[model samples]
Target: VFEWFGSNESGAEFGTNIPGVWGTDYIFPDPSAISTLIDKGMNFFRVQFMMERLLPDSMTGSYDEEYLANLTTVIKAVTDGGAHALVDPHNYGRYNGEIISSTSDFQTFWENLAGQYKDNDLVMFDTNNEYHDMDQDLVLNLNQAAINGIRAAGATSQYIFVEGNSWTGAWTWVDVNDNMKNLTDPEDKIVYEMHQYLDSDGSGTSETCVSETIGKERVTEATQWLKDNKKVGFIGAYAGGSNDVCRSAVSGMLEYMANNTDVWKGASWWAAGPWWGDYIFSLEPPDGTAYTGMLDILEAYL
Candidate 1:
């Protein structure tokens, strides 16, 4: 069977406009576009949403019911299309401009949010997204609390994906996220998640890849780490252009994962969304959206 090969649908968390108007400020993935991508051999969809949008009143207040319904619409589309849906609260370890300090709030958020998807095995809970520049112990506490909340809500069927610090980059995982191993999950279904880019700095920006094998080079350490710990990992984000060098880089990374199936699960391309007009890495429809050919590179692995 093919692993979770897909794209990130990232419009719900578009800008800093908190509780933004649904269609005007942000939007859920187009259900039609979701099915179109699925037909093209994709079986995963990382649906990005904002925690602020979900809880517009207060951290302890009830969620905005409208936002939850709209978000669920996109997730249902992904699952109904025969793909897994990753519910990502794309907050970089912060609720507003400040870092999340309320452990109780974090737990409560996941409890209500994960309870919504408790019955759906195709749905996965991403604790938080790309927590960076924070205390190592705090990261552990936040993830552990989120896990406890998820299980406390009786949402144990879905896998929980816990991310590392330093933008959750795979290259820095061993150094920055070694403490993440201490995070405990009630269901024993936690998976490590990290992002990698083929660019010089391993950041997603810049269309030029530094080397043809940079993709494999970036993920090499994390691969060994997973094997050593007997843990499974998934590449949460990666992208490269359609140039010959980038194509080889993408292929090399996939080849390494295929050879080491015991540790590597799969990867999703670094994105596809309605607002991404011409982002070089966007894997949105090729008919328009600047028509980058990253999906062509991913098709070989699928």
Candidate 2:
């Protein structure tokens, strides 16, 4: 049950607004497509919870029960489609669209949600998404705040995943390994969430262009690095390139996971978006030119 929340392309946290699928086609997720995924072996669906639209940061701990109700409806729909749900709070103090940083500033935001949904065992929580360049102190404190809030809100014993600094990169987790014990929680219920991605560095040096051996080593380092810090860890998100080197990177990454099943609990690809550079559904798959790197590999893995 480990995978990205809702196969969304338009980035809409709530509701189905896939910009380029059916016909510039905004269709709610097709039950048939969902059934197919389950039939093929999908376990978890990663989804986002936005305080802005749902509760809005300005409102604080008090949430619009209506919005929460609607969200509950959405979760049931997803589970009915046959997948467990992991909710990632994708809210931020500002509208920069980055990860939510600081528990004090956003504590009310999460508190309301946690309090409302704590009873649902199927719903897991992710502290923050892609918060970058933050100091280790903040990570430690914020992670503690999240755990406190969830437990205070009545999540007696549930697993919550936390991210490393620097937008969840593997190197970031490795660099901050020593400080992980600073995170305070009732039990070792936290799992590390790491993100893996490759982009045009202008220099020909990208993990996507590296040899499979090199890619494997990087992931190996990332996993061991987390294992040293926490009891559990997962490749939260990943994106591979369009080249053989990219293919090998994905293959190599999976190979490493195959060998170390205890630490490397698998990953979710960066997207289910229909397009690559543009917003056309045609850019998605089959004729999608580029492989939906994560989903392709998942088809075989799951």
Candidate 3:
């Protein structure tokens, strides 16, 4: 019943550099890294890429050919490794220091972006990353426009993830995104996405989890909202640190979703990319290391 169980493979959105050089500014996870997860029964990789890198010019302009190729390479590699490589446009609702306000332009971006993988069902589209501090109506509209563009561009065979406001936090879901129930697509393969962190503020910043009950506590209302609405949901990002208490905190979250599979599809830990050296929540191997500490707990659900 675990539809998508995996960890994020993120590196392309590393720094503040715009359209930075690959392998220098940023890099995608190697195929071997993904294959390693596949061997552990993980079946999804939220491959992160920068919007600036994908559309260096603008939404209306062309995609950087090299960036597209690199993205496609990993997408295929994940599927070849027998997992799902979901595309995560790591743009936080704004492009070029400006909040995206045009529905048509946002629509066109998806149209062009989805066109590349329209024929390939091995990938899925995450419409956009966390959209915070923007107009709630505009956030809903752009996501709706993205779905329209995807289907209009002849890409109807895949799932499109729609994220909500407030950093897409699970705790604030109903309050911030109750209106998001209006977002629709012709294919109806829409998955409501949210993020949950066990820390005190749910920001996923520190290694310390507030409490063991905090994990299930945060997602409880959001889970009910999804079930009541009869919609599926995905935890696009969630993580706990290496602490023993945090491990128990994370377990409660995954266990809650596992029990409520009717609306809880599954989750992807905040990340495991090649370059995340010494980052507390990282699942990436340090100098070719594999799953350690908290990952052992995460793997139990997988």
For candidate 3, write residues 134-212 as lDDT tens digits.
Answer: 9999999989998998898898998888999999999999998999998878788999999999888888988889998
Estimate, for each residue in 72-129, the C-alpha lDDT of model 2 and write its tens digit: 7656655776566567755422333444454675555556667766777776677877
**Which ranges of candidate 1 are over 4 A from the true structure?**
288-292
Which ranges of candidate 3 are over 4 A from the true structure?
286-290
Candidate closer to the true structure by lDDT (higher is better), 1 or 3 = 3
lDDT of each: 0.84, 0.56, 0.87
Best by TM-score: 3
State which candidate, 1 or 2, has the greater TM-score: 1
All candidates' TM-scores?
0.96, 0.76, 0.97
Question: Considering lDDT, which of the candidate structures 1 and 2 is the better prediction for this target?
Answer: 1
On lDDT, the candidate that comes out on top is: 3
User: In terms of TM-score, which candidate is stronger, 1 or 3?
Assistant: 3
Rank order by lDDT, top first? 3, 1, 2
Backbone collisions counted per model: 0, 6, 0
